[PDB]
Structures are given as C-alpha cells and as structure tokens.
C-alpha cells in the first residue's frame, strides 16, 4: 500500500498550488 504524503511534501504541494503551478 502506498504510504501518505508527510508534513514536509504537503507544503512543497502546498508551495506548488499556491504557485499555480500544480492543480488544486
């Protein structure tokens, strides 16, 4: 089973989102 994103890996996509630069 895959494992789930961490606190650091959701604020790098946190970081990516807000950039627009990956879908929300």
Known sequence: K???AS???L???Q???AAQ???K
């Open 7 to 9: 606190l650091a890996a």
């Open 15 to 17: 970081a990516l989102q």
């Open 11 to 13: 604020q790098a996509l």
């Open 21 to 23: 630069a990956a879908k």
């Open 2 to 4: 895959k494992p789930g």
